[PDB]
Design a protein around this ligand. Structure first.
Ligand SMILES: [Ca+2]
Length: 120
């Protein structure tokens, strides 16, 4: 599923403030990693990040690439490529509670200040 920035801002209204993340920070990361496409994948040599929230199989979900993964979200990574971002949000909240905003922002400085362009 492909979303617009406004569609997605409405679906994610609830996660705003969760664990200290701001919705526009999220939308910034999403624009750059998926173009708001729930089927996006970003590959690294060892691991892969899936879907809108770019959730890694290194730790967070089960995938044949990384059979040793801790699978902290107790879910197949395939669920992060479907059209239902509900499970993705569940796992992103776990990420926020365990790792925090750094998961998305530590290496995406542009999405940590001057964020007016991400408002609907
Ligand atoms: Ca999903």
């Amino acid at each position: 599923m492909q979303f617009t920035k406004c569609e997605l801002s409405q679906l994610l209204k609830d996660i705003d403030g969760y664990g200290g993340i701001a919705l526009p920070e999220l939308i910034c990361t999403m624009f750059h990693t998926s173009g708001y496409d729930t089927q996006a994948i970003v590959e690294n040599n060892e691991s892969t990040e899936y879907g809108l929230f770019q959730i890694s199989n290194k730790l967070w979900c089960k995938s044949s690439q990384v059979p040793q993964s801790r699978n902290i979200c107790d879910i197949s990574c395939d669920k992060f490529l479907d059209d239902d971002i509900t499970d993705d949000i569940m796992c992103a909240k776990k990420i926020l509670d365990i790792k925090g905003i750094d998961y998305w922002l530590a290496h995406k400085a542009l999405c940590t200040e001057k964020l007016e362009q991400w408002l609907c």
